[PDB]
Amino acid sequence: AVTGWQIINGNKYYFDTNTGIAAVGLQIINNNKYYFNPHTAIAATGWQSINNAKYYFDINTYIGTTGYKTIDSKNFYFDSNCIMQIGVFKVSDGFKYFAPANTYNNNEEGQAIVYQNKFLTINGKRYYFDNNSKAVTGWHTIDGKKYYFNPNTAIAATGWHTIDDKKYYFNPDTAIAATGWHTIDDKKYYFNPNTGITSTGETTINNKSFYFNDKGIMQIGVFKVPDGF
Numbered sequence: 001a002v003t004g005w006q007i008i009n010g011n012k013y014y015f016d017t018n019t020g021i022a023a024v025g026l027q028i029i030n031n032n033k034y035y036f037n038p039h040t041a042i043a044a045t046g047w048q049s050i051n052n053a054k055y056y057f058d059i060n061t062y063i064g065t066t067g068y069k070t071i072d073s074k075n076f077y078f079d080s081n082c083i084m085q086i087g088v089f090k091v092s093d094g095f096k097y098f099a100p101a102n103t104y105n106n107n108e109e110g111q112a113i114v115y116q117n118k119f120l121t122i123n124g125k126r127y128y129f130d131n132n133s134k135a136v137t138g139w140h141t142i143d144g145k146k147y148y149f150n151p152n153t154a155i156a157a158t159g160w161h162t163i164d165d166k167k168y169y170f171n172p173d174t175a176i177a178a179t180g181w182h183t184i185d186d187k188k189y190y191f192n193p194n195t196g197i198t199s200t201g202e203t204t205i206n207n208k209s210f211y212f213n214d215k216g217i218m219q220i221g222v223f224k225v226p227d228g229f
Contacts, residue, residue, distance in 0.1 A: 003016065013042065023041065024038045032063040033063065033064035033081075033082050034062055034063065045057050045058065045062060054110065055084065056082075056084070066078055077091065077098055084110040085098070087122055088127055094134040094135075095135040096112050097115050097127070117129065117131060127149070128140065128156070137154055147175060158170045158175050168197065168198070180193055187217055187218075188217075189218070190212065198212070198216035199216060200214060
């Protein structure tokens with residue numbers, strides 16, 4: 001009985017060393033994944049559906065693909081387990097959104113698509129897309145509203161966030177940087193409409209002086225300001 005790697009009638013079978021049996025199913029050999037047909041034990045190529053997970057096995061090396069790949073002039077992304085991944089991900093040229101099937105221009109499932117000048121919200125994560133179809137970073141003003149997008153994930157931010165030692169508050173539902181007076185947990189705060197930062201110390205508003213503590217909360221009673229009590 002032949003064992004080990006064998007090329008039989010031009011097809012790539014794999015009979016294991018120990019017991020010479022043909023190997024069938026998803027098989028991991030030398031840290032590389034293959035798919036051997038469960039009926040004929042032949043190594044297959046192309047697009048493969050295994051327990052509703054899609055893989056793509058190269059025509060030449062038969063090994064499962066990882067990372068970012070171009071197939072038939074369309075772009076796809078596969079995780080470490082070679083599974084076709086859907087969603088927003090980092091690729092060699094930036095950040096792209098790989099969308100479900102028949103989402104845009106009858107795209108294939110898991111294919112990269114064109115998506116410009118709009119927000120996308122995938123499983124409660126917001127992104128904004130520019131003309132280049134990436135997804136944007138840092139501080140942006142969109143429709144007169146301030147947003148922050150994480151420089152490492154392009155996800156829109158939320159909750160109290162300390163940036164350059166200055167606190168900002170982003171609405172938990174819409175992620176807009178809060179402006180003006182806001183009540184949070186029954187505590188009042190004031191954010192400057194021009195910069196968004198919280199108010200610390202005495203800050204006169206509309207010809208009326210108000211005091212905010214070190215942390216930013218608003219205190220009552222007698223307090224020291226530069227002129228006096």
